[PDB]
């Protein structure tokens, strides 16, 4: 119905807010987050279905407006990750724009330029908030949803990682400067004697990461321990009640905890794990169980894996002199959604 939408507005004199700018329908549900206009049920359920879905490339996965899986025009800015759908542009901005755009060399999306309006596309007044605001109101089991952050108010990320050194990764992700001194990352291996007072003085935190030691057991400390200490420490790390809230935490397991000692973890962390596998074309090299508050991490789950598989997968590894090489690659991209909250450092 997209070809008709533009008529409806300049002809039947409707108010965009009355046509699902996604699929140009007339049976609206509740207005559209990002741009001026409404949303149909079938269309909304999808908007949700893919909110912070990113890809190896590093950009968002679906159309910023319609959630189309087709080809997408990407922003030319490095602060932006949003991508815009061919038809969407054309159908709402004006005809023959996706042309002009695929033409342009230095493009800046709609949620990036000075002028508020282009064609019929109208970037809401202060959307970012209205977005989350939507999330809550519209999903059926809302989760921790933190308002996003305009490119100019994005201070650097302050991280604390227990047992495992992330640096290398968040570095490659564009989260850390090149200056390895004020480096907002604190690593600490032993915390058995650490008190809430320490953590507090340790400078306030934005992200607390942490994870169990690998299969190549080098440190003798009952797995379940880590789960526990991590938990503790975290509360310390948290912020003084009522403060804004850009606050994220994650705990990872390389299949080192067992059924019991795990059903535990999930109770303390308050969320069923999210096992992420490493593919090799049919085979299965490694895997990783995860816990976190980071935007949509409960979508990158591969129910395509079975317990009885891992149990064995964890047999051919304790059967060699493998290196404690920690399976980074797995989560590296999980952190992507954050690019929308903290400062990014161009390489």
């Amino acid at each position: 119905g997209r070809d008709l939408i533009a008529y409806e507005v300049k002809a039947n004199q409707r108010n965009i807010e009355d046509i699902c700018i996604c699929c140009g329908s007339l049976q609206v549900h509740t207005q559209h987050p990002l741009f001026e206009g409404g949303i149909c049920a079938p269309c909304k359920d999808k908007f949700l279905d893919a909110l912070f879905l990113y890809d190896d490339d590093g950009y968002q996965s679906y159309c910023s407006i319609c959630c189309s899986g087709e080809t997408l025009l990407i922003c030319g800015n490095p602060d932006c990750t949003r991508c815009y759908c061919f038809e969407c542009v054309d159908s709402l901005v004006g005809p023959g724009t996706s042309g002009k755009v695929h033409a342009m060399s230095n493009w800046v999306c709609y949620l990036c330029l000075p002028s508020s309006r282009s064609g019929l596309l109208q970037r809401r007044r202060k959307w970012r908030s209205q977005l989350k605001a939507f999330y809550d109101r519209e999903s059926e089991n809302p989760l921790e949803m933190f308002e996003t952050v305009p490119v100019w108010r994005r201070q650097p990320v302050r991280v604390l990682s227990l047992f495992e050194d992330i640096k290398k990764e968040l570095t490659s992700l564009g989260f850390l400067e090149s200056g390895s001194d004020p480096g907002q990352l604190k690593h600490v291996v032993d915390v058995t004697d650490t008190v809430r007072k320490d953590v507090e003085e340790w400078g306030p935190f934005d992200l607390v990461y942490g994870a169990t030691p690998p299969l190549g057991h080098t440190c003798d400390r009952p797995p379940s321990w880590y789960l526990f200490q991590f938990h503790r420490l975290l509360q310390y790390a948290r912020p003084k009640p009522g403060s804004p809230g850009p606050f994220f935490w994650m705990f990872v397991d390389n299949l080192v905890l067992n059924k019991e000692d795990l059903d535990v973890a999930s109770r303390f962390l308050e969320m069923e794990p999210v096992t992420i596998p490493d593919v090799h074309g049919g085979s299965l090299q490694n895997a990783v169980r995860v816990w976190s508050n980071i935007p949509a991490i409960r979508s990158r789950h591969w129910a395509l894996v079975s317990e009885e598989e891992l149990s064995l997968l964890a047999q051919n590894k304790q059967s060699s002199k493998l290196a404690a090489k920690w399976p980074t690659k797995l989560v590296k991209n999980c952190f992507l959604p954050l690019r929308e909250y903290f400062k990014y450092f161009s390489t």
Binding site: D57, Y59, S61, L72, I74, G76, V101, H102
Partner: peptide, 7 residues
């Protein structure tokens, strides 16, 4: 612009 499509 720059293009891209994912599965």
């Amino acid at each position: 612009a720059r293009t891209k499509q994912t599965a």
